[PDB]
Design a protein around this nucleic acid. Structure first.
Ligand code: K
Ligand code: MG
Ligand code: MG
Ligand code: MG
Ligand code: MG
Ligand code: MG
Ligand code: MG
Ligand code: MG
Ligand code: MG
Ligand code: MG
Ligand code: MG
Ligand code: MG
Ligand code: MG
Ligand code: MG
Ligand code: MG
Ligand code: MG
Ligand code: MG
Ligand code: MG
Ligand code: MG
Ligand code: MG
Ligand code: MG
Ligand code: MG
Ligand code: MG
Ligand code: MG
Ligand code: MG
Ligand code: MG
Lengths: 53, 303, 208, 23
RNA sequence: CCCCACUAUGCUUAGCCCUAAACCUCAACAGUUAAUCAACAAAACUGCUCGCCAGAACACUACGAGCCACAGCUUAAAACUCAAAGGACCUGGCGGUGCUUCAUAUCCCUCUAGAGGAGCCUGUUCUGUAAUCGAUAAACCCCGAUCAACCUCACCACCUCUUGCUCAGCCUAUAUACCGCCAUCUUCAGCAAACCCUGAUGAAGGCUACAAAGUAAGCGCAAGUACCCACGUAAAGACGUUAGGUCAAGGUGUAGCCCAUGAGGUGGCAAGAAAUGGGCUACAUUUUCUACCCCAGAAAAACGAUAGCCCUUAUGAAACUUAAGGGUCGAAGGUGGAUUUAGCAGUAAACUGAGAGUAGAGUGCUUAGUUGAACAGGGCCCUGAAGCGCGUACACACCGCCCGUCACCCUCCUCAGAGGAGACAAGUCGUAACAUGGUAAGUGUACUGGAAAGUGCACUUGGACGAACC
């Protein structure tokens, strides 16, 4: 009957899991910040030549 | 041109002597500050922008830095990097790179100048990325155990970068006190805090609990003394005017904290500053703008 | 914001400022040294180092405020606390010594516990997948949970059902009900949880 | 290339088929 | 279009039919890579041969002819009509366009307060009157007006004057001739003369920082300045967009009136069937009255009008109609639907003054001040913004273009009268095509349907699938 009194362990697990999900989002974002930008810079350094120079 | 600058210099000297005569001052000891004061008196102009007011300065300060001709009559440019178009900047880069090579073979008090400072040094126009590259090179030079022979060069691009305790006075009866002032919104308060006291506070001649019947305001008055744990130790006399009850309480709080700084230790003063007791709240009412209800409230849009 | 970005919010804790220098880790000493050379905002007029200062009650009073009448809001809050304490004292005295062990008389504790009980664990947020929004159940941050508890309490008090009943009495009665895990606020929290469970089938519509 | 010519031919053919069916 | 059922049909046999975007839209054979080559595409050519082509549409058509074909296929014209049709690109807009990243009171959720519900004030639209004018999506709607009893006044009715206050006059038309001052994106940051280069010297384009053709004076931003800081608010905000507003601030070109469209005088309209916009008042208990300006006492079905009626007073020559005060009455209403406004801090909200203009007149406007909050964390359906791309039959630029039926008139052709084509040309019903054209488009063929067209089978890209892994 949704009485939180008799579901404390499950509620606490749910809350801690949500907190860990937030932490995972933050750590994943910072870590993500090879990158397409770096890869494009390297390709620019060594670009394709479909013509004659 | 250089001849024009020389003529301007001669005219400036003649005018300096004439102005010394006009002001009756001695031409020999007649300085630039005196020139400025005399010109301000003679040609009073209230234009807000100081650069718009009359100026009689030396031609060096008046005219900008004119980059000299970089090639002789033979047509051959003087500097070996002239054709790069940024000869000064590239010479600097080349020298720094040479220093880095030499170092590689052999082995809060300042800041890096701004791009404008570098441009003025080189009398040349640069780019954001040029400045960034130069700063990265200088950073590498610094980190690479730059010796005195290198730090001498490095410093050419380095630019240099606590509550004021009021004096303690003594009343006619010899008891020590400190006086301070503080403004909040439209309320100004002057507070006198005695070295030894029983915590009594008299505001405008009225005891604090009667002047500030609001528990919030009395808490504000308590906060300074309570923080440094001196409740009941100092007596206080405050004269406050302007603003409402809350603004007056805040102003008295600021004045009391500033005065109490003198009677607390330096660590206590720094702690109060970090707690915000000593910082003047800059938040003041924003002026209403025409065509909108309030400072930010706009008239209800009619799509 | 009249405060430039350089300005930092003041910290108000006599214990923190009196902490021994030896107890400070390298990073903590560095933080103190940095703050020695930082700009700090002026202490807001809402908080002080008063040992009796309660941030939760301060925020509740702010939420209860109407049109910048801090005086009236604070008066209502103190009246509510006094009413709660008086009711608890009456019950304590009228109660037997055995149950007096359980009867609690600290109004601050009663208020904190009532709010914590009312805090809704899982909320319903609109989530859009494929162009259609649905009320997906979702975990809530602690800030949102506390705010929802306070807002439900205040709105329940402000409802017009209790006519000619002063806000101190209304709020004290509702707070006691919540503390004993009863009343319209707890009913509303359970209703939110029930709706979330009913819409449990849409949980996967969330992506974060 | 656009298909304007194909569309014109298609419309003409559709009209012709409809006319033949009609008559 | 989506879902279900089922048939011809797809299958086997024997005949017919002989059409496809039957396209690799690139003929067969032999040869060359040298001095290139409109554009794009799949580089440019040489020799030889066959077939084919000669403006568009009429036209995968009519006739003639042939055929196992009978609503068919192959070959295939002409008359009337037009100055174009067309192929490839560049720029711009547009996309119910792709990916990525954002919006910081901002597009959605989230916080606060509101509007949308009642009365009133007021603007507008409508109705009415003899009775102005202008704005009238954003960017109008307490707007021109920091203001209408007479005046203001440009309106209507009547009367009056004619070298007229003016070396006349005209608030007469033209903001789609203008100056003047402005909204608008703009809550932007780009605009750029003068040069240089790239494209075969086409319209056009000009970036990579471990840098690859850009340099740029000037303008804007920025900087500087007012306010209380270096923060914030102001101010500022270029080139242009909407032929955006104003010929009624004034002037001003063109046109128009001159015994009147000019001038003067008296009076008079400026109301509400009703809708709608903004604001004020409330719906109360965090309330109402009293004292005080925050330690009170009462009220509490009463709360609630600044509405109505009566009286007085202020200004004025004129007051039922303007304002203030008082008396009288205590009305609708009980926190309001989808929808929608503002706000990121001394802000929202509440409260208190002052000023502009008037003789007097606003709940309006400008502005000083007091108290003084909550959320500020997630996302991309929609709005939008940027970047990089894709498509493009649009170029008056999607409020675009354009198809077909039906009826609207002439030319020509076939025809026993009726059909067909074209042109002219405004309509009616849809939105089939051009953007992923909102179901990708189309070829052949079959059935179906006002109508474009829909669907079935195969075929084409003259569509895409975002082009390392995810
Ligand atoms: K309302
Ligand atoms: Mg046709
Ligand atoms: Mg094939
Ligand atoms: Mg055919
Ligand atoms: Mg035929
Ligand atoms: Mg025939
Ligand atoms: Mg908004
Ligand atoms: Mg209404
Ligand atoms: Mg008008
Ligand atoms: Mg109009
Ligand atoms: Mg008159
Ligand atoms: Mg009048
Ligand atoms: Mg006239
Ligand atoms: Mg115009
Ligand atoms: Mg600026
Ligand atoms: Mg501005
Ligand atoms: Mg216009
Ligand atoms: Mg107009
Ligand atoms: Mg006239
Ligand atoms: Mg009345
Ligand atoms: Mg009178
Ligand atoms: Mg009454
Ligand atoms: Mg379509
Ligand atoms: Mg389609
Ligand atoms: Mg098809
Ligand atoms: Mg069908």
């Amino acid at each position: 009957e949704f009485r939180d009194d008799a579901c404390r362990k499950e509620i606490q697990g749910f809350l801690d899991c949500a907190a860990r999900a937030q932490e995972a989002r933050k750590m994943r974002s910072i870590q993500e910040t090879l990158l397409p930008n770096k890869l494009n810079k390297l390709l620019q350094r060594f670009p394709n030549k479909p013509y004659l120079s | 041109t250089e001849d024009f600058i020389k003529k301007q210099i001669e005219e400036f000297n003649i005018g300096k002597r004439h102005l010394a005569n006009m002001m009756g001052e001695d031409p020999e000891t007649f300085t630039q500050e005196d020139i400025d004061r005399a010109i301000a008196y003679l040609f009073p102009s209230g234009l807000f922008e100081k650069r718009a007011r009359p100026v009689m300065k030396h031609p060096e300060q008046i005219f900008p830095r004119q980059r000299a001709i970089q090639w002789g009559e033979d047509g051959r440019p003087f500097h070996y990097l002239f054709y790069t178009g940024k000869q000064s900047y590239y010479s600097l880069m080349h020298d720094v790179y040479g220093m880095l090579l030499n170092l590689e073979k052999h082995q809060i008090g300042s800041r890096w100048l701004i791009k404008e400072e570098l441009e003025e040094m080189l009398v040349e126009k640069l780019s954001d990325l040029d400045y960034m590259q130069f700063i990265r090179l200088l950073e590498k030079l610094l980190t690479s155990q730059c010796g005195a022979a290198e730090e001498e060069f490095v410093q050419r691009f380095r630019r240099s970068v606590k509550q004021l305790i009021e004096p303690v006075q003594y009343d006619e009866q010899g008891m020590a006190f400190s006086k301070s002032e503080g403004k909040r919104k439209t309320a100004k308060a002057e507070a006198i805090v005695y070295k030894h006291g029983s915590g009594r506070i008299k505001v405008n001649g009225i005891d604090y609990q009667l002047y500030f019947p609001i528990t919030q305001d009395r808490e504000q008055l308590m906060f300074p003394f309570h923080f440094v744990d001196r409740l009941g130790k100092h007596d206080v006399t405050c004269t406050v005017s302007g603003g409402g009850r809350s603004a007056q309480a805040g102003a008295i709080r600021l004045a009391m904290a500033k005065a109490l700084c003198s009677f607390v230790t330096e660590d206590e003063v720094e702690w109060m500053r970090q707690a915000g007791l000593l910082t003047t709240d800059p938040r003041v009412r924003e002026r209403k703008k025409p065509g909108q209800e309030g400072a930010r409230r706009k008239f209800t849009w009619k799509k | 914001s009249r405060y430039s970005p350089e300005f930092k919010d003041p910290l108000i804790d006599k214990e923190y400022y009196r902490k021994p220098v030896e107890e400070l880790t390298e990073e903590e000493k560095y933080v103190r040294e940095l703050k020695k050379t930082q700009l700090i905002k002026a202490a807001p007029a809402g908080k002080t180092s008063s040992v009796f200062e309660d941030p939760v009650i301060s925020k509740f009073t702010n939420m209860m405020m109407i049109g910048g009448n801090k005086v009236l809001a604070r008066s209502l809050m103190i009246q509510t606390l006094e009413a709660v304490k008086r009711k608890q004292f009456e019950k304590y005295h009228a109660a037997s010594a055995e149950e007096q062990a359980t009867i609690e008389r600290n109004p601050y504790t009663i208020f904190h516990q009532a709010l914590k009980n009312c805090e809704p664990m899982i909320g319903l947020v609109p989530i859009l997948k494929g162009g259609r929004f649905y009320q997906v159940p979702v975990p809530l941050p602690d800030r949102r949970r506390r705010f929802l508890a306070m807002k439900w309490m205040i709105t329940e008090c402000r409802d017009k059902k209790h006519q000619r009943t002063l806000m101190p009495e209304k709020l004290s009665h509702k707070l006691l009900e919540a503390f004993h895990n009863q009343g319209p606020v707890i009913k509303r929290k359970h209703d939110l949880h029930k709706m979330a469970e009913a819409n449990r089938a849409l949980a996967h519509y969330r992506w974060w | 290339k656009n298909v304007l010519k194909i569309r014109r031919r298609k419309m003409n053919h559709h009209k012709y088929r409809k006319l033949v069916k009609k008559t």
